Amino acid sequence: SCQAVYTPEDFPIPSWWAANLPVHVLPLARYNKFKDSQSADLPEINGMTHSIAQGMSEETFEHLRLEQFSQRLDWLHTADLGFVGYHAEGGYTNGLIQMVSQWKNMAMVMARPVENPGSSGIPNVVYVAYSQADKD
């Protein structure tokens, strides 16, 4: 129950206690799509094949990094709180019921490095939410 309280106006979204029970987080999946520099020596760079990552302009590469960095995920969606599957009900009360088993699977936010942010605007330290649902 310690999450967002939505108003008729969309923004800003009110949140209760987000420092200890987060509301919108940067998941590991997005971290893995902006942490690498374009020069990286890997068959996959920021979730792209080496060939595609190296072939685009540097400006576009850094733009894709910042787009990924900006996708924040509802913390309630970092585990199955009853919204998963075809015609799943979701909703407030199912979250309460499912949190009794799912609390131990919710994303844990941890500081992580970005070795070469370059031109991208992404800070050298980012705070990344780790869970199994959000990891890839």
Least distance CB 16 / a copy of itself (angstroms): 10
Dist CA 78 CA 91 (whole Å): 15
Region near a copy of itself per CB under 8 A, out of 35-43, 50-58, 108-116 = 50-58
Least distance CB 51 / a copy of itself (angstroms): 9
Least distance CB 47 / a copy of itself (angstroms): 8
Q: Which is nearer to a copy of itself, 58 or 110 (CB)?
A: 58
Tell me which DSSP letter residue 13 carries: P
Amino acid at 90: G
Determine whether 85 is exposed, middle or buried from the number of CB atoms within 10 Å of its CB (0-12, 13-18, 19+): exposed
Among 90, 109, 112, 130, binds a copy of itself (CB under 8 A): 90
Dist CA 44 CA 30 (whole Å): 14
For Mg ion, the binding residues (CB under 5 A) are: 19-20
